[PDB]
Design a protein around this ligand. Structure first.
Ligand SMILES: C[C@H](CCC(=O)NCC(=O)O)[C@H]1CC[C@H]2[C@@H]3[C@H](O)C[C@@H]4C[C@H](O)CC[C@]4(C)[C@H]3CC[C@]12C
Ligand SMILES: C[C@H](CCC(=O)NCC(=O)O)[C@H]1CC[C@H]2[C@@H]3[C@H](O)C[C@@H]4C[C@H](O)CC[C@]4(C)[C@H]3CC[C@]12C
Length: 127
């Protein structure tokens, strides 16, 4: 049940993650505790990851499972990566960064490991 809109519900190791990745304070407090909306559309194996920022810049990155996708972050990073699925879980491969998206009881939880820190973000499914 990836298709749908997701809104910030909970998170774990936020500060730890940002402190490790070396995220600037200006962006950290800017992108924290904010209602990020992730709109997902089911297109075969191509899942659209749309990140909406309240009163700020938006980011939209679509990816096809087992296909290289063009991605961009909110910090202004242009890059590409390959995304695959492991048992209904969307996993992306990155250098010292591991992102996995899955559904836990009707909730979307993205796990991002970086430099040892495991960042989790639970988003509820709404329409
Ligand atoms: C919200 C800010 C961008 C704020 C912004 O640019 N506002 C308008 C402006 O000042 O131009 C973005 C930039 C870096 C983004 C973070 C980085 O991408 C790291 C990490 C990425 C995860 O997908 C979401 C959480 C997390 C931690 C992001 C939260 C949102 C951040 C902090
Ligand atoms: C790993 C980067 C964040 C790297 C970082 O440190 N950013 C800080 C900054 O914004 O400067 C995040 C931001 C965009 C995220 C990708 C986009 O959300 C698109 C896609 C979403 C899927 O749920 C997971 C794979 C995939 C491809 C995500 C993997 C993790 C990415 C690529």
């Amino acid at each position: 049940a990836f298709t749908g809109k997701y809104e910030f519900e909970s998170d774990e190791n936020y500060d730890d993650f940002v402190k490790k990745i070396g995220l600037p304070a200006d962006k950290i407090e800017m992108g924290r505790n904010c209602k990020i909306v992730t709109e997902v559309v089911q297109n075969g194996n191509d899942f659209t990851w749309t990140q909406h920022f309240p009163g700020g810049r938006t980011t939209t990155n679509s990816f096809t499972i087992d296909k290289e996708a063009d991605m961009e972050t909110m910090g202004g990073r242009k890059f590409k990566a390959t995304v695959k699925m492991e048992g209904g879980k969307i996993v992306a491969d990155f250098p010292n960064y591991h992102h996995t998206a899955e559904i836990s009881g009707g909730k979307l939880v993205e796990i991002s490991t970086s430099s040892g820190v495991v960042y989790k973000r639970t988003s509820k499914k709404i329409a």
